[PDB]
Design a binder for this molecule. Structure first.
Ligand SMILES: [Cl-]
Ligand SMILES: [Cl-]
Ligand code: NA
Length: 129
């Protein structure tokens, strides 16, 4: 599914991401925009043979099992395909664990390079929440 900006803001808010570990909602919406363009079916292969999955491009080397990344962990205890559902719950619950692990949202390269230090508020501007 391809969310709209405010639709996705509202789903993330309902799932408890607004202010999670001190990151306001605009941060999570900006990151989804630049990681997946709000498309829950996005996949992308990395140089090391791992793959990133879903609206927040979560990586199979650590976080989910796709049966094809030798020597990887599955720290969110899910198959990676669960992260491509039109229901973002699986992605959000795994992201909360990632963002809790010490390095915050710097885990998301596109957040670091395209959202960090910008007016992330703008991403929720105009939405009724
Ligand atoms: Cl915000
Ligand atoms: Cl932090
Ligand atoms: Na894995």
């Amino acid at each position: 599914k391809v969310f709209g900006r405010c639709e996705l803001a509202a789903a993330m808010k309902r799932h408890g991401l607004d202010n999670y570990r001190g990151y306001s909602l605009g941060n999570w919406v900006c990151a989804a925009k630049f990681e997946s363009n709000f498309n829950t079916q996005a996949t992308n292969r990395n140089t090391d043979g791992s793959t990133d999955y879903g609206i927040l491009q979560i990586n199979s080397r650590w976080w989910c099992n796709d049966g094809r990344t030798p020597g990887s962990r599955n720290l969110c205890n899910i198959p990676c395909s669960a992260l491509l559902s039109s229901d973002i719950t699986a992605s959000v619950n795994c992201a909360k664990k990632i963002v809790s692990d010490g390095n915050g949202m710097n885990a998301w390269v596109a957040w670091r390079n395209r959202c960090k230090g910008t007016d992330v508020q703008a991403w929720i501007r105009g939405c009724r929440l």
